Amino acid sequence: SECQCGICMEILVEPVTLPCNHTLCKPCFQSTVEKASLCCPFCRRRVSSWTRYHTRRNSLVNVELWTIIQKHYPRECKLRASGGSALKRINKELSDLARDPPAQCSAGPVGDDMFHWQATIMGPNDSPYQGGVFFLTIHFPTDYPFKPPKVAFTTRIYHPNINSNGSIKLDILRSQWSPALTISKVLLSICSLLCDPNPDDPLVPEIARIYKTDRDKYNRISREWTQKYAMGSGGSGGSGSGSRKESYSIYVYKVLKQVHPDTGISSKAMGIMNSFVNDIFERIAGEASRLAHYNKRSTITSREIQTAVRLLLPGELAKHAVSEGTKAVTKYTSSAKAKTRSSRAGLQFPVGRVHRLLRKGNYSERVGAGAPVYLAAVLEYLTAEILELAGNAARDNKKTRIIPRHLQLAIRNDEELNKLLGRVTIA
Numbered sequence: 433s434e435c436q437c438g439i440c441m442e443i444l445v446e447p448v449t450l451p452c453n454h455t456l457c458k459p460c461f462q463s464t465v466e467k468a469s470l471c472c473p474f475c476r477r478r479v480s481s482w483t484r485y486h487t488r489r490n491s492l493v494n495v496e497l498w499t500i501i502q503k504h505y506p507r508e509c510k511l512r513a514s515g516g517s518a519l520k521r522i523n524k525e526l527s528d529l530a531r532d533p534p535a536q537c538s539a540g541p542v543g544d545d546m547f548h549w550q551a552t553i554m555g556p557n558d559s560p561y562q563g564g565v566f567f568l569t570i571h572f573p574t575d576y577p578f579k580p581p582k583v584a585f586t587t588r589i590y591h592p593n594i595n596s597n598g599s600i601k602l603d604i605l606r607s608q609w610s611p612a613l614t615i616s617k618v619l620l621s622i623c624s625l626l627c628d629p630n631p632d633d634p635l636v637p638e639i640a641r642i643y644k645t646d647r648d649k650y651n652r653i654s655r656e657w658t659q660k661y662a663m664g665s666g667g668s669g670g671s672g673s674g675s676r677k678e679s680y681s682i683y684v685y686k687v688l689k690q691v692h693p694d695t696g697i698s699s700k701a702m703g704i705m706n707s708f709v710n711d712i713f714e715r716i717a718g719e720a721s722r723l724a725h726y727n728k729r730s731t732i733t734s735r736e737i738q739t740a741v742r743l744l745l746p747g748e749l750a751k752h753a754v755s756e757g758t759k760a761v762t763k764y765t766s767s768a769k770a771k772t773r774s775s776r777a778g779l780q781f782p783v784g785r786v787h788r789l790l791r792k793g794n795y796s797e798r799v800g801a802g803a804p805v806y807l808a809a810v811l812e813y814l815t816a817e818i819l820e821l822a823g824n825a826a827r828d829n830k831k832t833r834i835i836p837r838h839l840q841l842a843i844r845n846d847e848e849l850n851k852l853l854g855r856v857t858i859a
């Protein structure tokens with residue numbers, strides 16, 4: 433409807449309508465226009481005199497609108513009873529896109545990094561890119577939405593307005609950016625650009641010439657490139673790791689039985705164990721993603737997992753973790769394909785599930801089979817290390833059940849574990 437706020441992405445409250453006839457809620461207007469700019473954030477129209485004119489008379493609010501909004505949509509305004517900033521905006525855009533994604537597109541954060549997203553675009557049916565799946569990277573600036581996102585292809589594509597760096601010449605990405613635009617709108621505009629290039633303002637002149645001279649040749653090469661570079665990679669869909677809190681209680685219990693078979697673990701302690709596992713998962717995979725992008729690799733393999741482990745884990749933990757991961761990958765590759773993936777690897781932690789979580793987190797275009805095996809073995813090893821020391825702490829205190837205090841002692845009393853996990857809250 434026409435009653436949404438384009439800056440904060442909400443129903444308008446105390447709306448202020450500028451002479452350019454852009455409107456924004458009084459909170460946003462005060463934050464952006466009154467405090468500093470004295471210009472419309474959408475079109476940059478100067479409103480210096482107009483604001484002072486009305487501010488000294490308490491006549492900023494569009495009373496007719498405001499008064500109309502409250503009577504005609506009181507239920508919607510019940511939300512307005514409830515009523516960083518860039519982070520809030522990004523999160524709202526994700527919520528909206530997660531519900532109904534743009535046609536032919538999906539996008540979501542990379543791991544827990546809200547300012548770095550992955551996007552995928554299916555080649556429009558209209559276009560010669562049909563059948564291909566095109567990956568993109570999205571970086572939001574700190575002052576989003578008042579500055580555009582950086583959007584570039586990571587999949588090679590033949591197009592007059594997209595070059596070998598993946599850069600996209602498209603006006604709304606730069607000169608025509610406005611905080612009224614969303615990532616959903618951007619991806620749709622990119623889809624239209626694939627269907628209808630702009631050869632008159634090209635990024636790659638040679639391709640634009642062919643598009644204007646020999647369209648047949650343009651279409652043939654576009655299909656050839658689609659087949660060569662945009663096939664066999666559909667992505668994980670969705671919109672990132674989501675808000676679900678993953679549990680590994682099943683596997684923590686199994687490991688505890690192996691390490692301390694006469695020792696139990698409380699429900700609160702299990703919650704903390706899940707926090708440890710999830711935190712280590714995110715840090716290792718986030719670093720492996722960094723390495724894949726940095727080296728322009730479409731697939732995360734056990735190579736990036738190992739290098740991530742060597743950088744992030746301290747001393748002996750890193751060496752033992754690397755040994756465990758290497759041995760798991762070796763056992764996995766020389767095993768019978770009939771058994772379960774975890775069984776092939778000699779692991780308790782679920783290899784298939786870790787593989788899915790590595791794909792769901794948008795860390796890379798593809799994930800090789802060795803990666804989840806290596807990571808699952810590292811998570812299992814660290815879990816066993818923690819449980820061994822926490823059970824020792826329990827036994828030191830003449831207890832038979834691990835509670836959060838015993839987890840805090842295990843971490844604090846081991847120099848390397850405190851380095852790795854000391855920043856995770858227990859309390």
Ligand SMILES: [Cl-]
Binds near residue numbers: 799
């Ligand atoms: Cl994959």
Ligand SMILES: [Cl-]
Binds near residue numbers: 733734799801803
């Ligand atoms: Cl691999």
Ligand SMILES: [Cl-]
Binds near residue numbers: 831837
């Ligand atoms: Cl105790």
Ligand SMILES: [Cl-]
Binds near residue numbers: 830
């Ligand atoms: Cl006793």
Ligand code: NA
Binds near residue numbers: 434
């Ligand atoms: Na309108």
Ligand code: NA
Binds near residue numbers: 437457512
């Ligand atoms: Na609002």
Ligand code: NA
Binds near residue numbers: 671
């Ligand atoms: Na995804």
Ligand SMILES: [Zn+2]
Binds near residue numbers: 440441456459
């Ligand atoms: Zn607002």
Ligand SMILES: [Zn+2]
Binds near residue numbers: 450453454473476477
């Ligand atoms: Zn304006």
